[PDB]
């Protein structure tokens, strides 16, 4: 079939009609980014020659090619720790949560670490770790930071976010009640703080519900972490290919160096060895080049991840789709094998009504404009209200300012303004 | 059949006609000793960078 | 250790900021009689924030900090003659 | 070591180039790495054999060099793009991106040149003495719930004040500081106090 690009939507545009939400929801979404890859290393002489003296001596004819290949792989391996360090190790202190988890109704128990386990990971982190899942001079170097250490950095960032807001990311961690922290985050998206307090129970309940949905999504859908699985699969495939190439003859009587050596005298053995060297060296060079390109891709991802940690977790972003869809309020990191998972909490308007509007109201010849909000009408009376949440107020001189008169503004409404 | 390595007793079963085995990389994994018909595993001798 | 067999460094059960990385949580440094030691690295000092449902901390003073950030922009514009290099 | 990033770029290119030069000494199976030793001694039917193997080796070495430079060039370009972005957002304006223009709250930045690079001096504001104050989300006066327009409500243990969030500066709470919405029965943790009307 021909694919659809989506449903159609004809917006009821007119020169005097505005739609304003009267309710909202809280959404929590998941974003997954790769940070690092396995720090592999390949011995440029052992791969090609094993323990053969004759082969090793023939390789001297190629000068520095052998060492260049090891230098390149070493550089990649080092960079992999640099990438991890930049994404997670950006908190000056390891912060801890209080023994009493009173956050005004907001339940963070699924993202906070579990003290009963051998590795202090959160419930969500255990799900992430459970879901993501030859000797010829080939080795693997361990990462500098261990999974437990990553969990501790993640925990510190989370503890900071919960108890001191974004303050800890600029200076000292300064405690604030959680509900007040949310109030600031609401003012930060253009919604007056009284909206939070008057709906605190609702907001906390929607938040808690969203987290439960995340647990189910991750538990049931393995494909959810496909980006991290993809990095693993590509490196595994590249490495298996490098190994399989050792079986190619490349014109030789045998792919096995020992079969050549055990049967032929040097004047002939060298011919067969030389062609195997050429083939194996080319195969190894191909491998290294591909790893350099792949390494660059991962680094770019790591740089993005580090940026998001700084702008989504340690503050409140104004970039439109940067920290999830909807208006951003806050984010929480979780660790994952070779990567980071962000839970982005956003505000989404969710019930709009059709109101009549006007750019201004003229009273006794004076043109009055709102300081904040817009003028609306229910068909009988005019009110002024904040843009992102319907909350009508009587239009007074404390709501509007005056500039110009009835003859300048196009579409100005004839009404009165109350002076207290 | 030659090589360099460390031999240990295996815990796997060969069919009565099989003489040696191989791994995923198609290299020698194990052999049947010709005098005592027992199966030995071949482990590469340890190595690493310094 | 998990990173290999380390010979000549003295292992201690203290915790310090990482200097020369080894791997798998282990770093090494030269210190106090001065010798090479091995240790588990510290991730930083701990900080228990005095969180409560009615307490706020507010700064009464500030400082001005100036920091330096360094970025590469370019590299030497080299050129190699594909025939002369090979054949002279 | 302060400028190690720029020194690193220089060192890597120098090393790559020196490697390209050293490769000219490899024989690659030839009787001599020197093209002139081959030419001055062998007749063409034989000289060509020796020359052909040197060409293969030298050509492969050069191809390796170029590939590495293309990859390295991309890395530098990415850095340059970041530097250009910072000039635009840190020097030619005041950034809201949290760690983009240094740590702390950004005020302004000044560029300085450097060999093959740029150095930015980032000037930031850092809060530096906090004190413990009692707080509340709202104050209810005569049944009306009052919220600050800006700042927070604080208490020193006997009196409530309203102050800006980033710098302690207590003020008497008045009707010009707060707005009213709702009443004493809705806000959790609302404080019993009065608001002054000038
Ligand atoms: C936060 O949410 C968790 C569930 O995600 C709640 O855990 C329950 O705790 C009770 C004991 O009080 C157990 O009987 C239930 O079996 C637990 N549920 C699950 C799914 O394990 C936790 O109580 C909530 N915390 C707060 C303060 O509301
Ligand atoms: C705003 O929307 C929320 C839901 O997103 C409404 O709350 C629900 O109300 C129904 C009854 O109509 C209950 O059965 C649900 O359990 C409530 N949900 C939650 C999370 O509490 C809320 O009433 C709406 N508010 C307005 C003014 O329309
Ligand atoms: C807008 O309000 C004004 C009163 O403030 C109305 O009164 C006058 O109407 C006459 C006739 O059109 C005009 O010549 C005067 O200039 C108006 N007074 C002022 C102060 O402007 C006016 O009719 C109302 N306009 C509409 C469209 O209803
Ligand atoms: C527009 O809103 C006003 C209120 O601001 C509505 O008028 C009120 O209606 C109730 C009965 O439901 C009366 O008790 C109030 O005294 C009325 N207030 C005023 C100022 O008249 C009005 O009906 C709404 N109009 C529409 C079309 O929705
Ligand atoms: C909060 O302030 C009010 C006065 O504004 C106090 O006065 C009344 O107290 C009785 C008894 O609890 C209540 O039934 C009335 O509704 C209160 N009046 C009003 C306008 O709300 C009240 O006691 C104070 N509350 C506290 C906890 O100190
Ligand atoms: C809270 O601040 C008030 C001032 O806003 C302090 O009260 C003043 O104390 C001085 C003496 O140091 C008197 O001369 C003033 O007349 C007092 N003012 C008022 C309104 O009473 C008060 O002591 C401070 N409280 C605490 C616990 O430090
Ligand atoms: C606004 O009115 C149009 C008809 O003119 C209708 O199609 C649309 O659904 C209405 N929007 C809302 C939010 O009620
Ligand atoms: C809005 O559009 C209608 C279309 O019939 C027109 O009559 C009216 O004058 C317009 N008003 C303004 C302010 O543009
Ligand atoms: C080989 O000879 C030895 C010594 O007599 C005997 O123990 C062994 O079982 C024989 N093996 C086979 C396969 O004939
Ligand atoms: C390890 O810690 C104990 C105290 O629990 C101390 O007495 C001992 O000297 C320490 N040893 C090393 C090698 O750091
Ligand atoms: C706030 O009080 C706690 C004790 O409850 C104390 O540890 C902390 O240092 C105090 N903070 C400030 C800024 O005075
Ligand atoms: C704050 O916590 C204390 C804990 O003892 C509790 O008694 C009090 O009611 C709580 N106040 C609010 C507004 O949550």
UniProtKB/Swiss-Prot annotation, chain D:
<feature type="coiled-coil region">
    <location>
        <begin position="7"/>
        <end position="51"/>
    </location>
</feature>
<feature type="disulfide bond">
    <location>
        <begin position="90"/>
        <end position="101"/>
    </location>
</feature>
<feature type="glycosylation site" description="N-linked (GlcNAc...) (complex) asparagine; by host">
    <location>
        <position position="156"/>
    </location>
</feature>
<feature type="disulfide bond">
    <location>
        <begin position="140"/>
        <end position="184"/>
    </location>
</feature>
<feature type="glycosylation site" description="N-linked (GlcNAc...) (complex) asparagine; by host">
    <location>
        <position position="192"/>
    </location>
</feature>
<protein>
    <recommendedName>
        <fullName>Spike protein S2'</fullName>
    </recommendedName>
</protein>
<feature type="glycosylation site" description="N-linked (GlcNAc...) (hybrid) asparagine; by host">
    <location>
        <position position="132"/>
    </location>
</feature>
<comment type="function">
    <text>Subunit of the fusion protein that is processed upon entry into the host cell. Mediates fusion of the virion and cellular membranes by functioning as a class I viral fusion protein. Contains a viral fusion peptide that is unmasked after S2 cleavage. This cleavage can occur at the cell membrane by host TMPRSS2 or during endocytosis by host CSTL. In either case, this triggers an extensive and irreversible conformational change that leads to fusion of the viral envelope with the cellular cytoplasmic membrane, releasing viral genomic RNA into the host cell cytoplasm.</text>
</comment>
